[PDB]
From a paper:
[name] and [name]-like (SH3BP5L) proteins have recently been found to serve as guanine nucleotide exchange factors (GEF) for [name]. The coiled coil composed of α1, and α4 is solely responsible for the [name] binding and GEF activity.
To elucidate the GEF mechanism of [name], we also determined the crystal structure of [name] in the complex with [name] at 3.8 Å resolution. Wild-type [name] (10–276) was used for crystallization of the complex because [name]-RA tended to crystallize in the apo form. The asymmetric unit contains four complexes, where [name] interacts with [name] in a similar manner. The electron density corresponding to the N- and C-terminal regions of [name] (residues 10–41 and 268–276, respectively) and the N-terminal four residues of [name] were invisible, suggesting the structural disorder of these regions. In the [name]–[name] complex, both switch regions (switch I and switch II) of [name] interact with the coiled coil comprising α1 and α4 of [name]. As compared with the GTP- or GDP-bound [name] structures, the switch I region is pulled out by [name] so as to facilitate the release of the bound guanine nucleotide and Mg2+ (21). On the other hand, the P loop region, which binds to β- and γ-phosphate groups, does not contact [name] and remains folded as in the GDP- and GTP-bound structures. [name] interacts with the N-terminal region, interswitch, switch I, and switch II of [name] in the [name]–[name] complex.
Numbering used by the authors:
A (entry chain E): 4 to 173
B (entry chain A): 42 to 265
């Protein structure tokens, strides 16, 4: 009797594959599928319900749809979205250039009134930061978006940001 | 595989369908609380005004709701008796017409077709008189409770004449807020039912996707 909630916000995980969006919300969120659905469905589901303003809010996290197939149904993927998380790798400068394309992907299909958070995660455990934090944090505030740069070890900053995004909606 | 787009888009609509109902539920319930607290404070201020007649008239109004209740009983039993009386009228008419054909042709009493038209006709009247007498006693008993409840009410009207007059605006306002809360109760109970059907439709539109995901995994194990 812990699946009870009041509201249901919908946020999505977008960006390039391999950045580790799936493994970032491993300890926080709860994947509702016991087996990988990216290889089949293309999209994976996970959720984490918290209490905001006296009400239990269960946010629904839709994982990366993937480039290879099922791009036509990404229109329904982006629809009804409340928030979005851009996760690029700080070691790979290419992932920082593609998030500019995923942003324009939201402006075409996803809802206009969405709150997006740009996340720079250190997945590549062997390389330095090709993307400067200064220029990364500056670019995020130029598009009216939030920003946070985290690592695989300290999962403290991540969970605190997930509690903030949901509160702003209500 | 092509079933996915139909599920996600409906999962999408169901998500909004949940939030739109819980919000209305949160609103309807809030307006329900606002009235019950309003009904609570406005009833007490009438108790602090003239409370001498309020508690003394309660036996009357409680003896009046009984009279009304015993009235609907005597009213339903009358309709059920009136209906049960028309059963015999259509039954005894059939068993009377059969006797008429017996006087016309006396040799008809050996005809197997006429014996069957009597057998079923004389069977209905057996079951008709049974349901009649049962409905007849109920008609009289429910009428007795009515006349008794009319006595209980009228007698209490004599004793508490001055009482019910000073307490009349209390019970009148009490019922006005009753129906209002009753309506607000219905608008909450059904919205929480619609909310459940919204969450349920959302919970089932996820499990099928897990089935689809697990269905492909089994096909990826064997041959194409």
């Amino acid at each position: 009797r812990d699946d009870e909630y009041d509201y249901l916000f919908k946020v999505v995980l977008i960006g390039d594959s391999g950045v580790g969006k799936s493994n970032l919300l491993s300890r926080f969120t709860r994947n509702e599928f016991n087996l990988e659905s990216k290889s089949t469905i293309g999209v994976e589901f996970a959720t984490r319900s918290i209490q905001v303003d006296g009400k239990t809010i269960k946010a629904q996290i839709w994982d990366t749809a993937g480039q290879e197939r099922y791009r036509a149904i990404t229109s329904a993927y982006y629809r009804g979205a409340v928030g979005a998380l851009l996760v690029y790798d700080i070691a790979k400068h290419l992932t920082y250039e593609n998030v500019e394309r995923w942003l324009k992907e939201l402006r075409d299909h996803a809802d206009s009134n969405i709150v997006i958070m740009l996340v720079g995660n250190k997945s590549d455990l062997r390389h330095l930061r090709a993307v400067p934090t200064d220029e990364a944090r500056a670019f995020a505030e130029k598009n009216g978006l939030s920003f946070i740069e985290t690592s695989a070890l300290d999962s403290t900053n991540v969970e605190a940001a997930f509690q903030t995004i949901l509160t702003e909606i209500y | 595989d092509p079933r996915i787009q139909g599920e996600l888009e409906k999962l999408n609509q169901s998500t909004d369908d949940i939030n739109r109902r819980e919000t209305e539920l949160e609103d309807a319930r809030q307006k329900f609380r606002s009235v019950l607290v309003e009904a609570t404070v406005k009833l007490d201020e009438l108790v602090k005004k003239i409370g001498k007649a309020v508690e003394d008239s309660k036996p009357y109004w409680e003896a009046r709701r009984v009279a009304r209740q015993a009235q609907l009983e005597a009213q339903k039993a009358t309709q059920d008796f009136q209906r049960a009386t028309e059963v015999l009228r259509a039954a005894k008419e059939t068993i009377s017409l059969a006797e008429q054909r017996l006087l016309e042709d006396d040799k008809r009493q050996f005809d197997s077709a006429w014996q069957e038209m009597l057998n079923h006709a004389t069977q209905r009247v057996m079951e008709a008189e049974q349901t009649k007498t049962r409905s007849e006693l109920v008609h009289k008993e429910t009428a007795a409770r009515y006349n008794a409840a009319m006595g209980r009410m009228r007698q209490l009207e004599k004793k508490l004449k001055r009482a019910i007059n000073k307490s009349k605006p209390y019970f009148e306002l009490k019922a006005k807020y009753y129906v209002q809360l009753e309506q607000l109760k219905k608008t909450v109970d059904d919205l929480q039912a619609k909310l459940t059907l919204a969450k349920g439709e959302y919970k089932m539109a996820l499990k099928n996707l897990e089935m689809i995901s697990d269905e492909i995994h089994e096909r990826r194990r064997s041959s194409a």
